[PDB]
Amino acid sequence: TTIAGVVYKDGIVLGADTRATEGMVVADKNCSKIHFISPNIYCCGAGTAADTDMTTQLISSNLELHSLSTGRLPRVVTANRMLKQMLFRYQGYIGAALVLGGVDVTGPHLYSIYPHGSTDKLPYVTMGSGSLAAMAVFEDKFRPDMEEEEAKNLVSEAIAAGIFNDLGSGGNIDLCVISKNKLDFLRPYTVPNKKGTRLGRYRCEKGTTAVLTEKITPL
Amino acid sequence: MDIILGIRVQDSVILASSKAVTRGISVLKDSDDKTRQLSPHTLMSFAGEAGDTVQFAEYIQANIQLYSIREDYELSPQAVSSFVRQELAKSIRSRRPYQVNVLIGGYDKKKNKPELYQIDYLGTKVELPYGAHGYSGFYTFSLLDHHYRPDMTTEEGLDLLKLCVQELEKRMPMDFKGVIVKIVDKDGIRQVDDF
Amino acid sequence: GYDRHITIFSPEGRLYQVEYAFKATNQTNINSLAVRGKDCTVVISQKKVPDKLLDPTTVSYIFCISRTIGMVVNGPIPDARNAALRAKAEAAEFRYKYGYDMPCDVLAKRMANLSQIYTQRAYMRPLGVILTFVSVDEELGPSIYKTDPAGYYVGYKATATGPKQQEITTNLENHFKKSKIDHINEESWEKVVEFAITHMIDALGTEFSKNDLEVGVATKDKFFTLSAENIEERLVAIAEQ
Amino acid sequence: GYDRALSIFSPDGHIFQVEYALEAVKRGTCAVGVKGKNCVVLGCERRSTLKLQDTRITPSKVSKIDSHVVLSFSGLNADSRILIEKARVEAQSHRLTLEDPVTVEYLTRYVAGVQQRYTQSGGVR
Amino acid sequence: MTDRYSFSLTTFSPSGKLGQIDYALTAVKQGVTSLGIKATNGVVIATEKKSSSPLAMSETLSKVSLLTPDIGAVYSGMGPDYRVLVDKSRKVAHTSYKRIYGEYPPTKLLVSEVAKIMQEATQSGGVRPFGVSLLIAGHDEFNGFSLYQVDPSGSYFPWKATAIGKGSVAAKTFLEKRWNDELELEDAIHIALLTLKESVEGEFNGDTIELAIIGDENPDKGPRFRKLTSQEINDRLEAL
Amino acid sequence: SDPSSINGGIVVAMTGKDCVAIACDLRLGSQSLGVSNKFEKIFHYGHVFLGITGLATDVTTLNEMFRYKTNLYKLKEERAIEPETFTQLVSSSLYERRFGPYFVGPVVAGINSKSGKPFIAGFDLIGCIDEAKDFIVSGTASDQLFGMCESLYEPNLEPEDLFETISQALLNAADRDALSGWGAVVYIIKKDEVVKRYLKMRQD
Amino acid sequence: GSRRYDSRTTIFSPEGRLYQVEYALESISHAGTAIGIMASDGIVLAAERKVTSTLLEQDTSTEKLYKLNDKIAVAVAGLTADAEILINTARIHAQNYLKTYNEDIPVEILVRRLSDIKQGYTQHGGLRPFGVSFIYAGYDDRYGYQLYTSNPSGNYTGWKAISVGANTSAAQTLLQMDYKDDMKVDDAIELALKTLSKTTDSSALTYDRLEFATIRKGANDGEVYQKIFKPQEIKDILVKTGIT
Amino acid sequence: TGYDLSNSVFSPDGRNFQVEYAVKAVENGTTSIGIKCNDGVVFAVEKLITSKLLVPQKNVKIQVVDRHIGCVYSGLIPDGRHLVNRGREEAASFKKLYKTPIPIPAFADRLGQYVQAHTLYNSVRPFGVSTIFGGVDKNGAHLYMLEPSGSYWGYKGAATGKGRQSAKAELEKLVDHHPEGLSAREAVKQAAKIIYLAHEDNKEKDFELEISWCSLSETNGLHKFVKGDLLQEAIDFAQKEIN
Amino acid sequence: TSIMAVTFKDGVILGADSRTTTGAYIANRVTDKLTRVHDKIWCCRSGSAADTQAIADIVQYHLELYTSQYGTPSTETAASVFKELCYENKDNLTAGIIVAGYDDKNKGEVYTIPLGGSVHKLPYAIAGSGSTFIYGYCDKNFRENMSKEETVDFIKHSLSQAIKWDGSSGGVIRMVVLTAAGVERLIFYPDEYEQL
Numbered sequence A: 001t002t003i004a005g006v007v008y009k010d011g012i013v014l015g016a017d018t019r020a021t022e023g024m025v026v027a028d029k030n031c032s033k034i035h036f037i038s039p040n041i042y043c044c045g046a047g048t049a050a051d052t053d054m055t056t057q058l059i060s061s062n063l064e065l066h067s068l069s070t071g072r073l074p075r076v077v078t079a080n081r082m083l084k085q086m087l088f089r090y091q092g093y094i095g096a097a098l099v100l101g102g103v104d105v106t107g108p109h110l111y112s113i114y115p116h117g118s119t120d121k122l123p124y125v126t127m128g129s130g131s132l133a134a135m136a137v138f139e140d141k142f143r144p145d146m147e148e149e150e151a152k153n154l155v156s157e158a159i160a161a162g163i164f165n166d167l168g169s170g171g172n173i174d175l176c177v178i179s180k181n182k183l184d185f186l187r188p189y190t191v192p193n194k195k196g197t198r199l200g201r202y203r204c205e206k207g208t209t210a211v212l213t214e215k216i217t218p219l
Numbered sequence B: 001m002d003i004i005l006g007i008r009v010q011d012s013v014i015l016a017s018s019k020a021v022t023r024g025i026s027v028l029k030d031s032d033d034k035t036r037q038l039s040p041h042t043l044m045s046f047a048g049e050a051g052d053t054v055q056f057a058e059y060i061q062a063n064i065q066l067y068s069i070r071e072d073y074e075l076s077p078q079a080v081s082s083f084v085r086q087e088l089a090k091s092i093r094s095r096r097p098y099q100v101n102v103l104i105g106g107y108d109k110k111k112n113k114p115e116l117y118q119i120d121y122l123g124t125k126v127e128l129p130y131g132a133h134g135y136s137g138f139y140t141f142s143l144l145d146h147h148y149r150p151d152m153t154t155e156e157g158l159d160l161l162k163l164c165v166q167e168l169e170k171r172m173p174m175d176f177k178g179v180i181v182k183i184v185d186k187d188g189i190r191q192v193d194d195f
Numbered sequence C: 001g002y003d004r005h006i007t008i009f010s011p012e013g014r015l016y017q018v019e020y021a022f023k024a025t026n027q028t029n030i031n032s033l034a035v036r037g038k039d040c041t042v043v044i045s046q047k048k049v050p051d052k053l054l055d056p057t058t059v060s061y062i063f064c065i066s067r068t069i070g071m072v073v074n075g076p077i078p079d080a081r082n083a084a085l086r087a088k089a090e091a092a093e094f095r096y097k098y099g100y101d102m103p104c105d106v107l108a109k110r111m112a113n114l115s116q117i118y119t120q121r122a123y124m125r126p127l128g129v130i131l132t133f134v135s136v137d138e139e140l141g142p143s144i145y146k147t148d149p150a151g152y153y154v155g156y157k158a159t160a161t162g163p164k165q166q167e168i169t170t171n172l173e174n175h176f177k178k179s180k181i182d183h184i185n186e187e188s189w190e191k192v193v194e195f196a197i198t199h200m201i202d203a204l205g206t207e208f209s210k211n212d213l214e215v216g217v218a219t220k221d222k223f224f225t226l227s228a229e230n231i232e233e234r235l236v237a238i239a240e241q
Numbered sequence D: 001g002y003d004r005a006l007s008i009f010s011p012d013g014h015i016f017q018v019e020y021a022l023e024a025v026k027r028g029t030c031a032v033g034v035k036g037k038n039c040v041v042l043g044c045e046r047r048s049t050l051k052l053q054d055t056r057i058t059p060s061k062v063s064k065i066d067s068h069v070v071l072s073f074s075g076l077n078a079d080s081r082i083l084i085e086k087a088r089v090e091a092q093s094h095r096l097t098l099e100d101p102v103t104v105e106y107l108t109r110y111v112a113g114v115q116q117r118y119t120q121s122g123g124v125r
Numbered sequence E: 001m002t003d004r005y006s007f008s009l010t011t012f013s014p015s016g017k018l019g020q021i022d023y024a025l026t027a028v029k030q031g032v033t034s035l036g037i038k039a040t041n042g043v044v045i046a047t048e049k050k051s052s053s054p055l056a057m058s059e060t061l062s063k064v065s066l067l068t069p070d071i072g073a074v075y076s077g078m079g080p081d082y083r084v085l086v087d088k089s090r091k092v093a094h095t096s097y098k099r100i101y102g103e104y105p106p107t108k109l110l111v112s113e114v115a116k117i118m119q120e121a122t123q124s125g126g127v128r129p130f131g132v133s134l135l136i137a138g139h140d141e142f143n144g145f146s147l148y149q150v151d152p153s154g155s156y157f158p159w160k161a162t163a164i165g166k167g168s169v170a171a172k173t174f175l176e177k178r179w180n181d182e183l184e185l186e187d188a189i190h191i192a193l194l195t196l197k198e199s200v201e202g203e204f205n206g207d208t209i210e211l212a213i214i215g216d217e218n219p220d221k222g223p224r225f226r227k228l229t230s231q232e233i234n235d236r237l238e239a240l
Numbered sequence F: 001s002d003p004s005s006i007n008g009g010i011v012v013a014m015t016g017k018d019c020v021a022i023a024c025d026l027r028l029g030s031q032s033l034g035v036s037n038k039f040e041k042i043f044h045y046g047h048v049f050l051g052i053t054g055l056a057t058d059v060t061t062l063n064e065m066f067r068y069k070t071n072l073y074k075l076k077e078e079r080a081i082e083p084e085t086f087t088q089l090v091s092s093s094l095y096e097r098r099f100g101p102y103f104v105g106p107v108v109a110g111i112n113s114k115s116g117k118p119f120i121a122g123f124d125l126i127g128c129i130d131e132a133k134d135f136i137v138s139g140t141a142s143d144q145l146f147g148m149c150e151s152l153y154e155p156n157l158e159p160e161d162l163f164e165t166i167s168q169a170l171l172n173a174a175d176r177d178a179l180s181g182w183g184a185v186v187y188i189i190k191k192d193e194v195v196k197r198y199l200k201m202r203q204d
Numbered sequence G: 001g002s003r004r005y006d007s008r009t010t011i012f013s014p015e016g017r018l019y020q021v022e023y024a025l026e027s028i029s030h031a032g033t034a035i036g037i038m039a040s041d042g043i044v045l046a047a048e049r050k051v052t053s054t055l056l057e058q059d060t061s062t063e064k065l066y067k068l069n070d071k072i073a074v075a076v077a078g079l080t081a082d083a084e085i086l087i088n089t090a091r092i093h094a095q096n097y098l099k100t101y102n103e104d105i106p107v108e109i110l111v112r113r114l115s116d117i118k119q120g121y122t123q124h125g126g127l128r129p130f131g132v133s134f135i136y137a138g139y140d141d142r143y144g145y146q147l148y149t150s151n152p153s154g155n156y157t158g159w160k161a162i163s164v165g166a167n168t169s170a171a172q173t174l175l176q177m178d179y180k181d182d183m184k185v186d187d188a189i190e191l192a193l194k195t196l197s198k199t200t201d202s203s204a205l206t207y208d209r210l211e212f213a214t215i216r217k218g219a220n221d222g223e224v225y226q227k228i229f230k231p232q233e234i235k236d237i238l239v240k241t242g243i244t
Numbered sequence H: 001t002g003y004d005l006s007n008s009v010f011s012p013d014g015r016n017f018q019v020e021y022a023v024k025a026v027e028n029g030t031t032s033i034g035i036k037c038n039d040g041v042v043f044a045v046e047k048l049i050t051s052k053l054l055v056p057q058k059n060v061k062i063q064v065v066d067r068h069i070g071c072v073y074s075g076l077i078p079d080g081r082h083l084v085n086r087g088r089e090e091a092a093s094f095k096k097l098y099k100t101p102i103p104i105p106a107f108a109d110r111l112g113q114y115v116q117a118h119t120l121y122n123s124v125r126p127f128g129v130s131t132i133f134g135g136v137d138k139n140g141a142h143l144y145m146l147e148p149s150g151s152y153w154g155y156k157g158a159a160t161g162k163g164r165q166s167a168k169a170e171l172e173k174l175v176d177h178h179p180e181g182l183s184a185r186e187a188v189k190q191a192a193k194i195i196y197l198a199h200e201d202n203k204e205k206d207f208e209l210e211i212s213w214c215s216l217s218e219t220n221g222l223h224k225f226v227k228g229d230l231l232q233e234a235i236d237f238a239q240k241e242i243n
Numbered sequence I: 001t002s003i004m005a006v007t008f009k010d011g012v013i014l015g016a017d018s019r020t021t022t023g024a025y026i027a028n029r030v031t032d033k034l035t036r037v038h039d040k041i042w043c044c045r046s047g048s049a050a051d052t053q054a055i056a057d058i059v060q061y062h063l064e065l066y067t068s069q070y071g072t073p074s075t076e077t078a079a080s081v082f083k084e085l086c087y088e089n090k091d092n093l094t095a096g097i098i099v100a101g102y103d104d105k106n107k108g109e110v111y112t113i114p115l116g117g118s119v120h121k122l123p124y125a126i127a128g129s130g131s132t133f134i135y136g137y138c139d140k141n142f143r144e145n146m147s148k149e150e151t152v153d154f155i156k157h158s159l160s161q162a163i164k165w166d167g168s169s170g171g172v173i174r175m176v177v178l179t180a181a182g183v184e185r186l187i188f189y190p191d192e193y194e195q196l
Ligand SMILES: *[C@@H](CS(C)(=O)=O)[C@H](Cc1ccc(CN)cc1)NC(=O)[C@@H](NC(=O)[C@H](CC(C)C)NC(=O)[C@@H](Cc1ccccc1)N=[N+]=[N-])[C@@H](C)O
Pocket: A001, A002, A019, A020, A021, A022, A023, A027, A031, A032, A033, A045, A046, A047, A048, A049, A050, A052, A053, A127, A128, A129, A130, A168, A169, F123, F124, F125, F126, F128, F129, F130
């Protein structure tokens, strides 16, 4: 998995690959790793996939109830706290490694959240097995206060680094651009690999399989 | 406890269960009946860890007997087996699980059919024409694969069972001191006193 | 007639214990007032020290709940302090759980939901207090929210509470009918306090010394109460024009 | 929990809730027991205010507690089911631990002990 | 402090009446009029914003509440009781439904859950019943548009159109004449504004009326619940 | 020792044109010992099908649990549960045992009765959803099935074309696994008919 | 303390009656009449809705007839909200039994369970009883078609035909007069509607004031089917039997 | 009516009659006072000698909390002890967490909230004591008085019990005649006088004087009892002033 | 990590590096290890980031609630709350925290709380993995009642050496000055401190 985020001039750009693996096998080549928290806050997910999914859904659900009661958009710090305090309580056993990005009344904010409950507040972050490949791209080319299409290219370039160089990472590149004026959920942003074309048709002809008995029931 | 077999024939279920009770170096008893009557037409044999086996069997017996009194009705073998499986499936995630494997041989008076259920300590239930627990199956299943027919009589079932016990007496290292055999049919449960 | 002793419905669909708690509200015989400026929210309240043996510095019905939120109470001091301690605790817990300062209205609603519970559950009595919360909220700006023993709450442009609340309310109503705006169009809080005091003097028909008033001021990022000498300076400015 | 003492003494030394429970029994349909030399017979009344009844499925007045003991009653039907269930459970618990079914005296003593417990426990009638 | 009220405060009287439920319904009667009308392509719910003072900002007090994106609620009776029911309705829609099935509850089931909470205040130890009647309007994929009423007892009934509170008897008669099974949403809003004018004494405009709809999706879906603005109400009051 | 490979067995599901197919082997064992050749791993709750591989006691327990839950769902909702909704229910139910999980590999298959859209899904033992259009595989020969499915599969197959694809994927994968086989079942599921076929395969 | 305000819901009167049970029965006597009739080839459940306006959405409405599982249904008389609490408990008990034994719950066992819950509220806890009387219509393979009733006391009994709610005295006489043991479902449908038509406090019996249901084994391949009648179907059966 | 039979019930006035009945028990008790001085506080109490069999100086009424706070009360003596036990738990938990000894205003609210809690429910009785307490903290001297309702305020001087009006009048003279302040040793003498003057309301039985004090200079900010020569000097001053 | 707090004439200064490592990977090179629990009470964090963040948040909460009721807490009080958490949960925590604050009465104060949960009031304190390398330097060069410029140079030189030798330490040297005048944040980059 290669997930990343940057803070640019107008807001936040999140990025993620799409490969879900089970050991060495690829179960899904186009899975979604960028999760919805609130309308102005999204969360990229790495680590244990179920933990990542369910931790984001729970905090998203609780923030929705919080936001209905207060009548105002939720903040990234409250998303950060709720994730943080839960993950800390479970002492690392919930293996959720998140890149949390969103835009508040107080401006754009980006966090990295770790399974044990630590969080860093940063202008750029990377996580997952492809974090080093992605972080190399950010150390090479990041600068503060980038324009939108530039930041999009840098994150895309950082996810790509992970896709190609990390075996755990692969498939397409998803982006999520968050600013005060819009939210752009780009899935897929890029398709860096074409699906391999097969030269033969190996599908069997009808009646090839040996059947013992049959039953038909209508609905 | 060691060897427990079961075979479902045309009109009955036959359970064979070893007599030996061995703790360590010494055979403490050579006449142990590893079975409980749960209801008039349902018999359960059992094998596993010492203490747990009887405690579990007697606990199941008590619950089925309670059901029988409350409803003035005998539960089907299918229902009794599903109850037992759930108890074992509950057990396996306990603080201390019941280490007990069972065979439930019953005659369903509604369907007029014998039925044999094999359930392990995890709660792994299967309905079978013939079953065994532990190492017994390794020897016996190949015999039963060869010789079994669904339309066999009770006497043919007993002959096929003798052949199973002879093979176990030949090739197994432990002296299990023979087997107590019990037949479950439309008329209830009875013990074959000469085997 | 046990429907009047606990919080259950009377045949008219009424909760008499809630109504009697509202009457306990005026037992102190103190009037409070709250108004909003451009950058601020001002709350003023009468201060009465009848006993010469009392330490007048400890006689207060204004509370600093958080740094941003102030709360004035109309009602007896034991219930006031009950409510003050709980609001402080709630505001602190909120900041810990959600990572930002509790808004004025969110606290007001929270305290109101607690007050509602005492009107439905029989073992708990209502508190005999009306709680007026004030702040300069970072999203909604100058804010006045009020809670009562019924568990009712609402936001205000300005408000008044106490025995002579109707006189103060109508005085304020008439000013905002002229200006046609939801606030006091004034830059400095000092002048918004001067307005608040002036309009209480007019409404109640009584002059005030420095020791007859108690003032609380909310600005962006802090709520504070004025000292006797800060109020005296305020009274001097009123008299001089 | 609801702790309220419902069964209490009155100035003349009577527990009225217990005595009013007897009045509920007085209302109930008649039940009779006669023991012979080699048998016991339990007779029970069925009130004929209720016709259009399904006698196959309607709760019968005599209940088996075990294969060798029966319980009939007069009074509140719903209350009887609670005593019958408890007795049936205790009958199987006795067989399980003593390896012998209950005596009729033992089973009676148990049911009677449950009835007593409900006359000096809080929150119960 | 022992909560010693472990016993019911609502009990059957000799006549078979549950006193506290009846008295709660009397409290609902005294409350301000609210109504609901169901069209073919939507539902409308409406009520009067009875402002306690002109210094109070009545925009802050929401009588019409969003429960889910496709379900809205309005009430008549005690406002604080309504508020805590909305809190619990919103929460139960997540805990017992969204976190399980990954979707919001259908109108009827969310109504059933609210009804359950209200029933429990009618039987549990040491509590009075809720002093509100709710009108819940909503949409879901398999049941379509629906409108329900929920009373202090916990009893609920589906309606084509109805009204509760102050002038409900008169309002229900008004709706019986005007309602048909071929109404469009705009026709229903028109009828709601007509019906609500009868029970309102004072000012009748977008600032003193609260009105919301369950209709088309407003841009995974968009939310069907929409609260009409002060301006949107006034526009329809000129074509009245 | 490893709970997911004591009893053995496999499930595969595929989508086609206006249809889905789900298939399973029939083996239950105690490691090397074959015990039952009638242990089906596909169940159904209305028109939604659920395959479950893994520890057999948990397979049985979960079947009983989802029957329970979908029955109450239908009574309350007044309609049968849909594949999309059931998938979320499975995920929830598995994750609530996060730190003491059911040792299973479930597979949902069905057609949404309203939209008509063919649907399949898979899960890990703690409920993370694999949400793939093409195919879902599970069990002790999952690697084998992944290989068979990736080379045999193509989109929009007609029901009886799809039958030949899923059957050959199952059979040839099972024959490369010691703990799978002993018979097989294939369900071909269309919007208002379901064809259940038992396959002839080698019995070793 | 709190003792002052305690109604004491679980006590005997001097006559040996449970006050609250008796008063709950009085409550139920005012509820809309529900009738159950058991035939040789099925069971009929018929029930009268109450108050009704022209504006009540009838097709999505359910106040009387509820489904517990595929074999067992109930007709309600009393507080609908109280019934729904008990109904959801019963629905769970049926699924717990199904999960445990892998067989559908026998009708009597379910009925006893609910009845035992009702009983508990009369003997302990200090809470008011449930103001509900059920008619249970169900089938199992031991006793076949069964009708039962329970009431707030927790007492239950079996019936060939029975009524609950309003005018039960009058209803039970009319049923006792025209019921016969060899009767069939189509005849029982007619008897149920004729009984309601005479005992109703309304001016006339119409489709919009009725809920109606049948439990027939009358299906292809001897399997039990529950039919909750739609508004249009109740209107048709009212014309067929000649009431409208 | 019936509004006075249960605690936590509002009468139609808005009053809690049970609390007002607790005040009657307070008014029935012996006279106790508190005097705030320059750098500390002084507490004094009237102890009625019911019999010659009472051991002199043994039945001590004034109680210490932590090491720096004095508490005295009038009314039901056991209720006062119960409140001080709680005060000691509060002062202990405060010091455990925050290290510093509990400030007097902080401590005052701890007692205040606890006493107020006993007006919230019908399952408890209100406290039958008015409690005068105080001491020296980092911000200087503080004297408080706490009523059955939970009401408390800071005081220059405080008095409660049967002789409270007599005492209050005397305290008011001291406040007027000493605006610059009263010394600790002066306050001890004045406390003795005021108890002796307030003894006219309990004049049937003779009494025993008990005084305590915290002063920054005289006791290092710790609560001590006035004993021996300093006690006798205060008694002599008091006896001289009544004659 | 290399952290320190040093009292001086006008108050106290806290100092820290900015490196956070996961093994040999620098996860965050611009970490803020100086965290605010009150206006003029701050702490330097070392150990488990999750633990020290969780503690610091709880302390901030306790002191916020203290301030609501009893006014500004002393630096000693803050140290006592840190201690209470660290000591009572010693089995589940890995936190080495320096607490530093400015009163007007007490002036600058530094409390160190090592792994055990013990408290030690000191004129200055050093902590974190890089502190081992500067015990010698700091002991030789520290004086009491230094000026602000002297104390900034003492911390800058000290952490410079800690950074030079400790791989776990690095990046920028952040500082936080606590005086009557207010709160000043300072930053010093590698190009400045490496050439010292
Ligand atoms: C990349 C993470 S990594 C190793 O840091 O690069 C992805 C991130 C990710 C996030 C979200 C989603 C979808 N919501 C997918 C992927 N993580 C993984 O791919 C993890 N894989 C899994 O968790 C898989 C998921 C299945 C559905 C393919 N599950 C398993 O590998 C285990 C589950 C399990 C996990 C922890 C403890 C016990 C079991 N299997 N089974 N069965 C990453 C762990 O590979």
